[PDB]
């Protein structure tokens, strides 16, 4: 029951022919895979790490300027030459100052001078890449056991390791059997276009090309304490006034100046092992060997009593908490639902099969009521506990919320969203291929449009589609206008 | 000369004493006694919490994180007046001197 | 700043987004509009940094 309370959870029903379910785990989101006869487990992608990641193209932030040296030549003969120019540690530019009999030159005219300064950089900003061999996603798994206290408990699940070397990992669960999850970490997140840049023990995930094209001096990337930099002219701001001479400045520290130039990326931890706490991962949850516990237990007879007053989660689920106040052996808890004194059983148990392992400790159940007045009978007999709950809502509203959830999932994941909670089907693959083609075209067209420009482009294109001809009207208007408006209203996460 | 400082801007900041409080859902915004100090920047926000966080009622709760802000290196903007401006002009006459 | 002086248009100097103060030298100048430096990231709705 680790999933309950995260507010970003979502249910995954149905099983395939050989009892496998494809789910795409996301950080901050934990799927709940129910089944006909399997325990309704909860899986959340716990933490993704990376070890022994290398470096490339370490970059410079602020500099020091020392050994300012100047040299000038007589006008109209040669151009100023200084031996320090050949050295990679000195940066300097040519300018044409004036000279005359005041400066001792024989003939009046413009004469070149050069002012070179030593660029000892300081506070580098390393950009580090991670390759697939060292990736390690970690998956936590929790079962709705109806335990005494695991209602929202984030340290009450078995953990399984995942690496690209061995991705078809096992998972041995206590007294429930095992589940095999044959994930593919190769397609979840790119990580071949992602470069981790570290600045003052802070780091983000940036695109490779965007990091490469930064107007700041870049080094080779080796481990040498004193490297040779390139494009040092970006931080020296040579200036000459009145053409008498020119002076050199350091142009300050760009530590906070690039601190909003890097504004759209996600942050990372980079504390020892660099946990990323972002991205997603798809996995195939073949639930064939996972038989639920206590199938053959009897059913109890004595009455139950609530302990914590029943309350509803965000998704309409009811968390009943009961303690079997009797003396019977471990049993299965009965459950019944009636609407308007008519036994229609318009209720479902999100927990697969609730049992009372120990009499003393209370048991908690996550039931799901219908859209209206409904009395939930728990025990058997005349004195059975009865809970009267009224969930306020309608089926149309729930359908609209599910549509919004699916639209958000497609807008964030992209083509992979078709794999979420989807048994292998002909329609799913046919939609997947079409969406891959369309999404590739869309991202090639719009790769690099801002949150404020997508809305404008969508409005302009729907305006074009309002008044047009030859079905370009309908196509452009509906497709591009609606899609671009949604992606301009959702993009920033 | 004799120009006066008008206002000071801050270009480098340090954050100390990060403090946080959170209330249950369907209760007022979380409160610190430090919200009303002149040197504290403090922003309300939301958070999800249910039985896992010790609160009976499920839903979105409100937590606030006040922080004390002190500047490290200000940048001054100083206006110049008109009763102190002094121009200086050299008048060198062509004498054909050596 | 740091032994560098510039001449800027007065209105532009007021417009730029940095926390300002009264200007008269004193202890603990209470900064105004100081939210421009502090950034409040929310770690996917669980807690705040």
């Amino acid at each position, epitope marked *: 029951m680790r999933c309950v309370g995260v507010g970003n959870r979502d249910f995954v029903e149905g099983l395939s022919g050989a009892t496998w379910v494809d789910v795409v785990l996301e950080h901050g989101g934990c799927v709940t895979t129910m089944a006909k006869n399997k325990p309704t487990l909860d899986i959340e992608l716990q933490k993704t790490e990376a070890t022994q990641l290398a470096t490339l193209r370490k970059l410079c932030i602020e500099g*020091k300027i020392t050994n300012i040296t100047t040299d000038s030549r007589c006008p109209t003969q040669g151009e100023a030459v200084l031996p320090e120019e050949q050295d990679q540690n000195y940066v300097c530019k040519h300018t044409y100052v004036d000279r005359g009999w005041g400066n001792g030159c024989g003939l009046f005219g413009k004469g070149s001078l050069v002012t070179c300064a030593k660029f000892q950089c*300081l*506070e580098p900003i*390393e950009g580090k890449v991670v390759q697939y061999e060292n990736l390690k996603y970690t998956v936590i798994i929790t079962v709705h056991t109806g335990d005494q206290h695991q209602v929202g408990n984030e340290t009450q699940g078995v953990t399984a390791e995942i690496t690209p070397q061995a991705s078809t990992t096992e998972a041995i669960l206590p007294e429930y059997g095992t589940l095999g999850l044959e994930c593919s970490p190769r397609t979840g997140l790119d990580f071949n276009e992602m470069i981790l840049l570290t600045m*003052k*023990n802070k780091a983000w995930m940036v695109h490779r090309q965007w990091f490469f094209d930064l107007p700041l001096p870049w080094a080779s990337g080796a*481990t040498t*304490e004193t490297p040779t930099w390139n494009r040092k002219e970006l931080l020296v701001t040579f200036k000459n006034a009145h053409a008498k001479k020119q002076e050199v400045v350091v142009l300050g520290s760009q530590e906070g100046a690039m601190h909003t130039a890097l504004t759209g990326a996600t942050e990372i931890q*980079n*504390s*020892g092992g660099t946990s990323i706490f972002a991205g997603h991962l798809k996995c195939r949850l073949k639930m064939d060997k996972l038989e639920l516990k206590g199938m053959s237990y009897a059913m109890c007879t004595n009455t139950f009593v609530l302990k914590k007053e029943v309350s509803e989660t965000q998704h309409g689920t009811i968390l009943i908490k009961v303690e079997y106040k009797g003396e019977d052996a471990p049993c299965k808890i009965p459950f019944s639902t009636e609407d308007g004194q008519g036994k229609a059983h318009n209720g479902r148990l999100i927990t697969a099969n609730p049992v009372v392992t120990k009499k003393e400790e209370p048991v908690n159940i996550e039931a799901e009521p219908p859209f209206g007045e409904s009395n939930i009978v728990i025990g058997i007999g005349d004195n059975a506990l009865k809970i009267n709950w009224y969930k306020k809502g309608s089926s149309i509203g729930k359908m609209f919320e599910a549509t919004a959830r699916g639209a958000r999932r497609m807008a964030i994941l992209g083509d992979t969203a078709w794999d979420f909670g989807s048994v292998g089907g002909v329609l799913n693959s046919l939609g997947k291929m079409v969406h891959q083609i369309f999404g590739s075209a869309y991202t090639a067209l719009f790769s690099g449009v801002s949150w404020v420009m997508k809305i404008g482009i969508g409005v302009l294109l729907t305006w074009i589609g309002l008044n047009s001809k030859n079905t370009s009207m309908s196509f452009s208007c509906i497709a591009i206008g609606i899609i671009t408006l949604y992606l301009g209203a959702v993009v920033q996460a | 000369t004799q120009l006066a400082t008008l206002r000071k801007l801050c270009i*480098e900041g*340090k*954050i*100390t*004493n*990060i*403090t*946080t409080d959170s209330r249950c859902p369907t209760q007022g915004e979380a409160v610190l006694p430090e919200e009303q100090d002149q040197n504290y920047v403090c922003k309300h926000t939301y958070v999800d919490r249910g039985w896992g966080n010790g609160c009976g009622l499920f839903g979105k709760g409100s937590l606030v994180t006040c922080a004390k802000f*002190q*500047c*490290l*290196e*200000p940048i001054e903007g100083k206006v110049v007046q008109y009763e102190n401006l002094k121009y200086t002009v050299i008048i060198t006459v062509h004498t054909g001197d050596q | 700043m740091k032994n560098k002086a510039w001449m800027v248009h007065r209105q532009w100097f007021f417009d730029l987004p940095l926390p300002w103060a009264s200007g008269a030298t004193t*202890e*603990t100048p209470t900064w105004n509009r100081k939210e421009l430096l502090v950034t409040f990231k929310n770690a996917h709705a669980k807690k705040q940094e």
Partner: antibody
Framework: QVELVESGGDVVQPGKSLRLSCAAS????????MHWLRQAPGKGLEWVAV????????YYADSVKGRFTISRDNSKNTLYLQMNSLTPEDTAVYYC???????????????WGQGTLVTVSS | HIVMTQSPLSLSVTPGQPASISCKSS????????????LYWYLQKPGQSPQLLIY???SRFSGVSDRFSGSGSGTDFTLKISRVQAEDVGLYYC?????????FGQGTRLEIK
């Protein structure tokens, strides 16, 4: 680029007073919370006293309580440590340290002064 | 006052080998309000004023070679030096910063074997 220089270390007989001055440069001195530090030869570093950004939040250590006075003068960019009732145990090289520019602690050490030694004997 | 204990009082390592120092506190150095362990580490080079290496534990001060790395949590912290150079000889001082009477640990040392 920060530069901290010490002054005032000299030989002195027990009981007599002495004032230690820490001149600082390269940063706005008035918006900081300076510290004092010391180390006897062959021993570890020992904390002495702290003056906060606001001049009215001074503190001292137990072994030096009620015997030392720490004071800042913002205008002259110097840190004054007036020490009284000095003893031959208290003699050591004294370090003047700066605050942590990047971090969360209100009290920490980014940069240490050059260090002056005060010699106490009969 | 916090008693600070450093596991080694002298380390002799040949160049190219890792040297690790363990500094165990006497009480918890984790500030509960923010959940950050406030520990510090200083290197005093021979005949020099000490500098700073590791503010907090995970973080690392600027102008510091990438080899130095802080580790540990909850009263038992640890440094690591992947490759030791001739310039790493000195007097590494772990100090707590949580409580106002800042107490350094007894000075450890690192000499080339």
């Amino acid at each position: 680029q920060v530069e901290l220089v010490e002054s005032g270390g000299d030989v002195v007989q027990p009981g007599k007073s002495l004032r230690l001055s820490c001149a600082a440069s390269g940063f706005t001195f008035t918006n900081y919370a300076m510290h004092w530090l010391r180390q006897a030869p062959g021993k570890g570093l020992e904390w002495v006293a702290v003056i906060s950004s606001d001049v009215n939040d001074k503190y001292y250590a137990d072994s030096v309580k009620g015997r030392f006075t720490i004071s800042r003068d913002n205008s002259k960019n110097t840190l004054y440590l007036q020490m009284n009732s000095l003893t031959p145990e208290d003699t050591a090289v004294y370090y003047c340290a700066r605050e942590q520019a990047v971090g969360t602690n209100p009290w920490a050490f980014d940069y240490w002064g050059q260090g002056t030694l005060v010699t106490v004997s009969s | 006052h916090i008693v600070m204990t450093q596991s080694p009082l002298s380390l002799s390592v040949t160049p190219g080998q890792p040297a690790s120092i363990s500094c165990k506190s006497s009480q918890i150095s984790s500030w509960g309000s923010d959940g950050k362990t406030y520990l510090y580490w200083y290197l005093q080079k021979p005949g020099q004023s000490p500098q700073l290496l590791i503010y907090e534990v995970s973080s690392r001060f600027s102008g510091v070679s990438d080899r130095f790395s802080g580790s540990g949590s909850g009263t038992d912290f640890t440094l690591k030096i992947s490759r030791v150079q001739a310039e790493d000889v000195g007097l590494y001082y772990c100090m707590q910063g949580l409580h106002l009477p800042l107490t350094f640990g007894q000075g450890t040392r690192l000499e080339i074997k």
